[PDB]
Design a protein around this motif. Structure first.
Motif, short mmCIF file in Angstrom:
data_model
loop_
_atom_site.label_atom_id
_atom_site.label_comp_id
_atom_site.label_asym_id
_atom_site.label_seq_id
_atom_site.Cartn_x
_atom_site.Cartn_y
_atom_site.Cartn_z
N UNK A 31 0.82 -1.19 0.00
CA UNK A 31 0.00 0.00 0.00
C UNK A 31 0.85 1.25 0.00
N UNK A 32 0.63 2.13 -0.96
CA UNK A 32 1.41 3.34 -1.09
C UNK A 32 0.48 4.54 -0.94
N UNK A 33 1.01 5.72 -1.23
CA UNK A 33 0.25 6.95 -1.06
C UNK A 33 0.79 8.01 -2.00
N UNK A 34 -0.04 8.48 -2.92
CA UNK A 34 0.31 9.60 -3.76
C UNK A 34 0.45 9.24 -5.23
N UNK A 35 1.23 10.06 -5.92
CA UNK A 35 1.35 9.94 -7.37
C UNK A 35 2.10 8.69 -7.77
N UNK A 36 3.03 8.21 -6.94
CA UNK A 36 3.67 6.93 -7.23
C UNK A 36 2.69 5.78 -7.08
N UNK A 37 1.73 5.91 -6.16
CA UNK A 37 0.69 4.90 -6.04
C UNK A 37 -0.23 4.91 -7.25
N UNK A 38 -0.57 6.10 -7.75
CA UNK A 38 -1.39 6.19 -8.95
C UNK A 38 -0.64 5.65 -10.16
N UNK A 39 0.67 5.90 -10.22
CA UNK A 39 1.49 5.37 -11.31
C UNK A 39 1.55 3.85 -11.25
N UNK A 40 1.66 3.28 -10.05
CA UNK A 40 1.66 1.83 -9.94
C UNK A 40 0.30 1.23 -10.27
N UNK A 41 -0.78 1.94 -9.91
CA UNK A 41 -2.13 1.48 -10.23
C UNK A 41 -2.37 1.48 -11.74
N UNK A 42 -1.86 2.49 -12.44
CA UNK A 42 -1.96 2.53 -13.89
C UNK A 42 -1.01 1.51 -14.51
N UNK A 43 0.10 1.21 -13.83
CA UNK A 43 1.06 0.24 -14.32
C UNK A 43 0.48 -1.17 -14.33
N UNK A 44 -0.13 -1.60 -13.23
CA UNK A 44 -0.72 -2.94 -13.21
C UNK A 44 -2.19 -2.92 -13.64
N UNK A 45 -2.46 -2.30 -14.78
CA UNK A 45 -3.83 -2.09 -15.24
C UNK A 45 -3.96 -2.61 -16.66
N UNK A 46 -4.88 -3.54 -16.86
CA UNK A 46 -5.26 -3.96 -18.20
C UNK A 46 -6.43 -3.11 -18.66
N UNK A 47 -6.35 -2.62 -19.89
CA UNK A 47 -7.41 -1.78 -20.42
C UNK A 47 -8.50 -2.61 -21.10
N UNK A 48 -8.13 -3.74 -21.71
CA UNK A 48 -9.09 -4.54 -22.46
C UNK A 48 -10.06 -5.26 -21.54
N UNK A 49 -9.64 -5.56 -20.31
CA UNK A 49 -10.51 -6.23 -19.35
C UNK A 49 -11.67 -5.34 -18.95
N UNK A 50 -11.37 -4.12 -18.49
CA UNK A 50 -12.43 -3.17 -18.15
C UNK A 50 -13.19 -2.71 -19.39
N UNK A 51 -12.53 -2.74 -20.56
CA UNK A 51 -13.21 -2.43 -21.81
C UNK A 51 -14.33 -3.42 -22.09
N UNK A 52 -14.00 -4.72 -22.12
CA UNK A 52 -15.01 -5.74 -22.39
C UNK A 52 -16.02 -5.85 -21.26
N UNK A 53 -15.60 -5.56 -20.02
CA UNK A 53 -16.54 -5.52 -18.91
C UNK A 53 -17.57 -4.41 -19.09
N UNK A 54 -17.12 -3.23 -19.53
CA UNK A 54 -18.06 -2.15 -19.77
C UNK A 54 -18.92 -2.41 -20.99
N UNK A 55 -18.38 -3.14 -21.98
CA UNK A 55 -19.19 -3.59 -23.12
C UNK A 55 -20.32 -4.50 -22.66
N UNK A 56 -20.01 -5.44 -21.76
CA UNK A 56 -21.02 -6.34 -21.23
C UNK A 56 -22.04 -5.58 -20.39
N UNK A 57 -21.60 -4.57 -19.65
CA UNK A 57 -22.51 -3.82 -18.79
C UNK A 57 -23.46 -2.95 -19.62
N UNK A 58 -22.94 -2.30 -20.67
CA UNK A 58 -23.83 -1.53 -21.53
C UNK A 58 -24.68 -2.45 -22.41
#
Ligand SMILES: [Mg+2]
Ligand SMILES: [Zn+2]
Ligand SMILES: [Zn+2]
Lengths: 1266, 87, 108
Positions: free
Chosen positions: A256-283
DNA sequence: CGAACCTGGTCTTGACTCCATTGCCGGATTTGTATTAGACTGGCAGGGTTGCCCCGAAGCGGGCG
DNA sequence: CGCCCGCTTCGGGGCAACCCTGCGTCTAATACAAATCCGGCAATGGAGTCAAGACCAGGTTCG
């Protein structure tokens, strides 16, 4: 890519910059908060001005001074380190700052919507707590290790919890033993039982404190266990003590971190296609608010997925530095230095970064480092955009510092200035004076100013003739004004046009070229016929003079923008070079006819003959030079040089009475013969009285049937004759010429007695205040009109005050009534009528109270004038900003659709009466279909201009409705075609294949808005073009049938009974102040009304008439409603100038069914794009989208464009630029707004490729001739 | 901006360079060569009499004599009024 | 009335010749993280060993010539501030007292 | 027609000499860092104006019982 | 016949974007070391300068 930029461009692609590109543009890391040396005034090493980083201050010189020659070029000194080059590379070289800890961008976090919060699906008031070091976040979790060890971990949890249980049981047993000892020592001695009960209750409170302290410890252990079970990523742990208790236990199972390095790590371990297809299924499988939020997030998620971007660049690791020539530290005269207000922001960033680096190398507790990182983040935020987050960083005297984003937005940004325009060389201005001897293509010039404009031309010319040895002695010869420079100046001035300009430039004729000629004095002499175009009088107005330089500019000013080439309006086609104030009076006196003047022809033949005839106009001119013939007496000349009218020509000669030899007699005055000699030969005789409308008809006929040069020469001749006879007309003003009506006083006494009876009836109490105010207003309006009628019938015809009015020179009759007669009612400050009223006139002189009453309306008129010209300027800006990309592209689109014109409906007797609004609606248009009469012959075929004589032929044949072409039904994709636009009003011929008709239409609409003297004024136009809902919104029906008219209590409940079997549509809140619509009589209950019939009186909102009556009828309603406003002032605008604007409204369609092709509901895309992909996607994926026509206003449709660079200049330059930067939106440079900005040639007029690549070569027959 | 280009001195400099080239072409080949190599008019490097006598194969004193002769030749009103008007 | 300004930089006017220039070499410098940069030095000029690169960190020369590596000293420590004010006998006194205190707190 | 001379650039050599180029050394000034032992322990621009967008009660009508 | 429950509709709140009802003086040095300017001789060494003085070549004058 292109870093040299040699004038060939296709695309301007924006995109989100990353840390690698930022540290790849840079030429060195700036690492000190120093700007300049305080003593020697040289830039410091590794500072914000360092010559190693940005380059040399002096041309071709290193810092230490070893190399100073151009022979050493492109090399770098061994000691100082400065690359020897030009001193203009400090304009372009950039540097970067290496941050010690990462920092979020302020743009993708603190907007609506927050793009970081949408990309991570986190609330913005939690993201603000994360990036400002106020709350931790869970950057990672390990579900599998907790999953397979949770049994042992809860066993140790139970061990600790049972240890707390055993400890608190020992505590309770210790308190029980102490209370047993208290009881045994209390009941053994003589003690008070109340104090013994208090001792027992104290022991009980002690053990209860034990038990609830233990309960609180168990609740703490079970709370940290509940949180350790519910440990999910993107979880906030507020107040930090639970977090510190949760780190030391099971640190190896989560981070657990705090600040902009935490946001950078959150964006680092982030798949875009997973939430993409999840939002496709939700809509796909959603309903309500959930699907709407998933749509608004799928926007930015598919924006980051579809382009080749990455979400890493929203956190930032290296900040670039703008070059120091754009933020210069310039000294003035006297050492008062002038910085550029960004150096303070850069210094704060450098200072806090260096302090953070020192703190990290030193090793400090967490409070100091977190405070320093928060200050660093806020410094970068204040650098990028000051005043966004809370209070702005201010300088001396509470003045906020102009940050880096404040160079773009606002009224003082780069974009708004770059659209506002630059300042130019080779220009000048002066006051203007009238020029009544010049020809129409001439203009005067003060020679002391023209010597300044043409200084390089005269220097080259007086070098070429041997008057000076070089340009230096020539320049000194010009400055001393030696007397040869005047002849050289005339030689270089001859045949070289200049531009003239009077601010404000309202329309296209505000800039007109002229040929100069030298004039003594110091004021610009202007031709007295272009004052109507310039809207300039000589009360002290000033005009700017520019100067074209190149051959292309000289040819454009000589052919396109000449004064004598622009006679007619661009708006309506009426002439602007018509005679006016003085020369109209001159021609009216010259052409009027007096009964019984000196030398009048009488045919009385007793002893003597008639003695009124004259053999020639030369003999008549001799007999009028001698004091016998007056000019306005009726004679019978024998003319041999003027073409007779049609009846006399067909009578005397039949086929062609070519008057250059023929002779014929005519009973006229001498004056009409002298007038008709100004007109050309082929034009017939007139024999009328030259009222201003008669002169308008004459010049319109001359412009229609003749070339332009004949019209210019005829207008010059008419000006000369009009002035010369305006002097001899004898129109003076004396107070013995302002005659009063004789029976004014008895009229005023009679209406005074009626007003006295009304006031006495109010004093009885039989009526209220407002009814007696209405009665007095009506009585004094009647008295005003009676006095005006008596004054109108009292005056003679040769009174100057009535001659100037009745000849149409200037003024109306109401000003003569207020001069002599009665002023009338005077308004209040609000707009009510003072019921007194003024019973005097300005000849008789007012009194004190009447003057004080008149001043209210005078001041209201002045403030109304100021507000109206400001609003007209804003509306012109909006219209130009919408319709600037409607230019003519093809010659004929070859469609078949077209609008229909009413065109002179008939009478109950059956006679075709001419409709009044033909010359604005039906003229200058090209027929889409043919014209057949009574199933007989085709009178006018398809493809004709619809001028005068074919309209007269259609009316003679007896046809009314015609189907004509217009720009609403044009079928080209990029602009309109030439046949659909019809005749250009400024020329009279067909429009060309490069015209910019959109700006012409926008200026023609927005120009006469200052004369719109008023919901019926300029807001009525503005609420129509914006497609807003009106105030007096009368409803409309949806289907036919009799009405269920019901007038409820204080508001009506109008229901409509359908014609067929259908529902009864109820209209809820119709207040009684609205009125019943009168049509065919007043509205009644059970009136069988039509489909889109307006229900009450008022103005229907055009959104409802679109959804009911489709796309054709709303165009008919939107034009007719705007054209009803301009007819109130007698302002003539042709309908094609409005049909261009209405065409730009209905270009888009809404989406209700996405189909299967990249679509979203609620989107508004182009009709030409929605159908074109639906032509292809019906095969291989045939789920077509469902479209419907929508009507959006001008302010909305101007924003949704395809070029980010144009839409940046409008509004919210922050918001327009950031979402363009996410989507990596490329620009194509096709509108004429962007080509102005980058300085490229605009794609209109002489800029399109049909005209720019003309090859010119002499003819091969004439090539051998020399 | 007082440190900008006045835009008449630049074209005056170009015209002065052209007139200087024509005036030096009104002399001989060797005289124009030794003056141009003395004052660095062609590359921007002022050589000395040793380098001029090296490139022509003669003493430094002969080069100095030729230079003084050419400086006396240029100091004429007929040869130098057009250059006098440039200052 | 009018106020004038001047940046502190001389402006020349010459001809940007591309043909006849002073010739020059090229040397490659190497930073710590494998970055290479090429610097055009003049001919009649000494080639310095180390050179501050465009990257911002100090980069040595790509050919091994072994200049002076450090030639420096550490500035100051808190241990130096302690040692310059007290003796090692006093330090050992506090150390033995703290060792007896952690002993009596741990197992005593 | 032959000899003597005047003066043209042409070129060498010997002597003078003069001024930039380092170079050292001593001092003056100028800039940067360390150190001061009674006790002292949580503040301040700031609101006001105008306009537009997003969520919550609430009728409310349709599904539910 | 009554009752829940999300769907739509308007309110209120909340928030984002622009002006002025905006627009303070502060312990006080010492001690020392390093860097840098600079002032003044102190070697020059190459570059310019004067003067003699020789080098013939072809008009120019004289026989
Ligand atoms: Mg005026
Ligand atoms: Zn240097
Ligand atoms: Zn068309």
């Amino acid at each position: 890519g292109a870093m040299l930029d040699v004038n060939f461009f296709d695309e301007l692609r924006i995109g989100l910059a990353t840390a690698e590109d930022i540290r790849q543009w840079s030429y060195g890391e700036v690492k000190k908060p120093e700007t300049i040396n305080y003593r020697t005034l040289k830039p410091e090493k590794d500072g914000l001005f360092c010559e190693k980083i940005f380059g040399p201050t002096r041309d071709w010189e290193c810092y230490c001074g070893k190399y100073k020659r151009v022979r050493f070029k492109g090399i770098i000194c061994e000691r100082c380190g400065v690359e020897v080059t030009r001193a203009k590379v400090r304009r372009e070289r950039m540097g970067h700052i290496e941050l010690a800890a990462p920092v979020t961008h302020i743009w993708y976090f603190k907007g609506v919507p927050s793009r970081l919060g949408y990309l991570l699906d986190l609330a913005p008031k939690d993201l603000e707590k994360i990036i400002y070091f106020a709350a931790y976040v869970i950057t990672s979790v390990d579900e599998e290790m907790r999953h397979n060890e949770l049994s042992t971990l809860e066993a140790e949890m139970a061990v600790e919890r049972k240890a707390v249980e055993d400890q608190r049981d020992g505590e309770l047993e210790a308190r029980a033993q102490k209370l047993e000892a208290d009881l045994a020592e209390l009941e053994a001695e003589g003690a008070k039982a109340d104090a013994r009960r208090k001792v027992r209750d104290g022991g009980e409170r002690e053990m209860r404190q034990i038990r609830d302290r233990a309960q609180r410890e168990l609740d703490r252990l079970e709370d940290i266990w509940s949180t350790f079970t519910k440990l999910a990523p993107k979880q906030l742990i507020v107040d930090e003590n639970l977090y510190r208790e949760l780190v030391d236990r099971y640190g190896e199972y989560f981070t657990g971190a705090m600040g902009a390095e935490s946001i950078q790590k959150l964006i680092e371990n982030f798949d875009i296609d997973a939430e993409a297809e999840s939002l496709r299924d939700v809509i796909r499988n959603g309903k309500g608010q959930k699907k709407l939020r998933a749509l608004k997030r799928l926007k930015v998620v598919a924006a980051f997925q579809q382009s080749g971007n990455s979400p890493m660049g929203m956190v930032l690791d290296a900040v670039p530095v703008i070059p120091p020539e754009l933020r210069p530290m310039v000294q003035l005269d006297g050492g008062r230095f002038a910085t550029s207000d960004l150096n303070d922001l850069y210094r704060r960033v450098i200072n806090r970064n260096n302090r953070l680096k020192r703190l990290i190398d030193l090793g400090a507790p967490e409070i100091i480092v977190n405070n320093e990182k928060r200050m660093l983040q806020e410094s970068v935020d204040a650098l990028f955009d000051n005043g966004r987050r809370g209070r702005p960083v201010t300088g001396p005297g509470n003045r906020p510092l102009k940050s880096l984003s404040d160079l773009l937005k606002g009224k003082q940004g780069r974009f708004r200035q770059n659209l506002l325009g630059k300042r130019v060389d080779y220009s000048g201005r002066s006051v203007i004076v009238v020029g009544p001897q010049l020809k129409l293509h001439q203009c005067g010039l003060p020679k002391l100013m023209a010597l300044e404009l043409f200084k390089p031309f005269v220097m080259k010319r007086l070098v070429d003739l041997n008057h000076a040895q070089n340009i230096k002695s020539a320049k000194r010869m010009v400055e001393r004004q030696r007397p040869q420079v005047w002849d050289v100046l005339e030689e270089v001035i001859a045949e070289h046009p200049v531009l003239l300009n009077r601010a404000p430039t309202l329309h296209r004729l505000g800039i007109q070229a002229f040929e100069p000629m030298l004039v003594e004095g110091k004021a610009i002499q202007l031709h007295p016929l272009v004052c109507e175009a310039f809207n300039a009088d000589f009360d002290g107005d000033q005009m700017a003079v520019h100067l074209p330089l190149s051959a292309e500019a000289q040819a454009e000013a000589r052919i396109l923008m000449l004064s004598s080439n622009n006679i007619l309006s661009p708006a309506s086609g009426r002439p602007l070079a018509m005679p006016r104030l003085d020369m109209v009076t001159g021609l009216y006196y010259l052409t009027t006819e007096v009964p019984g003047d000196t030398g009048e022809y009488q045919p009385a033949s007793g002893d003597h003959p008639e003695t009124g005839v004259y053999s020639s106009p030369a003999e008549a001119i001799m007999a009028a030079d001698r004091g016998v013939l007056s000019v306005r007496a009726k004679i019978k000349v024998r003319l041999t040089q003027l073409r007779p009218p049609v009846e006399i020509e067909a009578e005397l000669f039949g086929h062609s009475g070519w008057q250059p030899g023929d002779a014929w007699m005519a009973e006229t005055t001498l004056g009409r013969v002298m007038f008709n000699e100004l007109l050309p030969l082929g034009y017939p005789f007139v024999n009328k009285q030259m009222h201003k409308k008669v002169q308008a008809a004459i010049i319109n006929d001359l412009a229609e049937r003749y070339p332009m040069i004949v019209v210019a020469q005829t207008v010059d001749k008419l000006k000369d004759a009009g002035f010369y006879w305006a002097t001899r007309s004898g129109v003076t003003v004396s107070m013995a010429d302002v005659l009063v009506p004789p029976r004014k006083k008895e009229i005023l006494d009679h209406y005074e007695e009626r007003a006295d009876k009304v006031e006495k009836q109010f004093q009885r109490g039989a009526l209220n205040h407002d009814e007696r105010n209405e009665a007095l207003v009506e009585i004094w309006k009647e008295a005003t009109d009676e006095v005006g009628q008596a004054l109108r019938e009292h005056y003679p015809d040769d009174n100057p005050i009535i001659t100037i009015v009745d000849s149409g020179a200037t003024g109306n009759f109401t000003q003569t009534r207020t001069l002599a007669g009665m002023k009338g009612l005077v308004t209040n400050p609000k707009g009510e009528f003072i019921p007194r009223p003024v019973k005097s006139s300005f000849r008789e002189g007012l009194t004190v109270l009447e003057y004080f009453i008149n001043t209210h309306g005078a001041r209201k008129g002045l403030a109304d004038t100021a507000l109206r010209t400001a609003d007209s300027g804003y509306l012109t800006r909006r219209l130009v900003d919408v319709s600037q990309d409607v230019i003519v592209r093809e010659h004929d689109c070859q469609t078949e659709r077209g609008i229909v014109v009413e065109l002179a409906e008939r009478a109950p007797d059956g006679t075709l009466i001419r409709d009044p609004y033909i010359e604005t609606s039906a003229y200058a248009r090209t027929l889409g279909t043919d014209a057949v009469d009574e199933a007989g012959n085709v009178i006018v075929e398809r493809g004709q201009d619809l001028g005068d004589p074919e309209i007269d032929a259609l009316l003679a044949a007896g046809i009314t409705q015609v189907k004509v072409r217009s720009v609403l039904t044009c079928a080209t994709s990029t602009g309109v075609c030439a046949t659909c636009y019809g005749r250009s009003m400024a020329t009279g011929k067909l429009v060309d294949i490069g015209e910019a008709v959109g700006i012409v239409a926008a200026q023609s609409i927005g120009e006469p808005g200052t004369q719109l003297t008023m919901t019926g004024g300029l807001p009525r136009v503005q609420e129509l073009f914006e497609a807003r809902v009106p105030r007096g919104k009368a409803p409309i029906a949806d289907v036919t049938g009799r009405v269920r008219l019901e007038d409820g209590e204080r508001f009506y409940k109008i229901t409509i009974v359908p014609d067929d079997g259908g529902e009864e549509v109820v209209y809820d809140k119709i207040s009684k102040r609205q009125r019943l619509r009168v049509f065919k009589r007043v509205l009644s209950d059970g009136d069988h009304v039509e489909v889109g019939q307006q229900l009450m009186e008022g103005s229907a909102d055009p959104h409802e008439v679109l959804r009911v009556q489709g796309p054709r009828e709303v165009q008919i309603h939107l034009v007719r409603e705007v054209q009803e406003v301009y007819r109130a002032q007698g302002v003539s605008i042709h309908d094609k100038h409005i049909e261009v604007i209405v065409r730009q409204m209905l270009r888009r369609v809404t989406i209700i069914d996405s189909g299967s092709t990249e679509f979203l509901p609620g989107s508004l895309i182009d009709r030409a794009e929605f159908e074109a992909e639906n032509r292809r996607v019906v095969a291989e994926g045939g789920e077509p989208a469902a479209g419907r026509p929508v009507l959006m206003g001008i302010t909305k449709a101007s924003l949704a464009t395809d070029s980010w660079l144009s839409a940046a200049s409008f509004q919210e330059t922050t918001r327009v630029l950031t979402d363009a930067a996410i989507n990596c939106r490329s620009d194509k440079l096709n509108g004429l707004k962007e080509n102005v900005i980058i300085g490229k040639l605009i794609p209109a007029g002489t800029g399109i490729n049909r005209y720019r690549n003309i090859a010119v070569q002499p003819t091969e027959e004439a090539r051998a001739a020399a | 901006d007082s440190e900008a280009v006045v835009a008449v001195d630049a074209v005056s400099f170009t015209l002065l360079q052209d007139q200087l080239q024509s005036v030096l072409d009104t002399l001989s080949e060797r005289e124009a060569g030794v003056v141009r190599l003395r004052f660095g008019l062609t590359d921007g490097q002022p050589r000395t009499l040793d380098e001029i006598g090296q490139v022509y194969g003669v003493t430094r004193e002969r080069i100095r004599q030729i230079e003084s002769k050419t400086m006396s030749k240029l100091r004429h009103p007929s040869r130098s009024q057009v250059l006098r008007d440039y200052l | 009335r009018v106020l004038r300004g001047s940046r502190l930089g001389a402006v020349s006017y010459e001809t940007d010749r591309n043909h006849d220039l002073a010739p020059r070499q090229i040397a490659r410098y190497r930073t710590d993280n494998g970055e290479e940069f090429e610097v055009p030095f003049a001919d009649d000029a000494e080639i310095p060993g180390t050179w501050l690169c465009r990257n911002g960190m100090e980069g040595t020369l790509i050919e091994g010539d072994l200049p002076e590596p450090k030639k420096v000293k550490p500035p100051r420590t808190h241990w130096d501030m302690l040692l310059e004010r007290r003796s090692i006998e006093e330090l050992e006194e506090l150390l033995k007292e703290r060792l007896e205190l952690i002993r009596s707190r741990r197992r005593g």
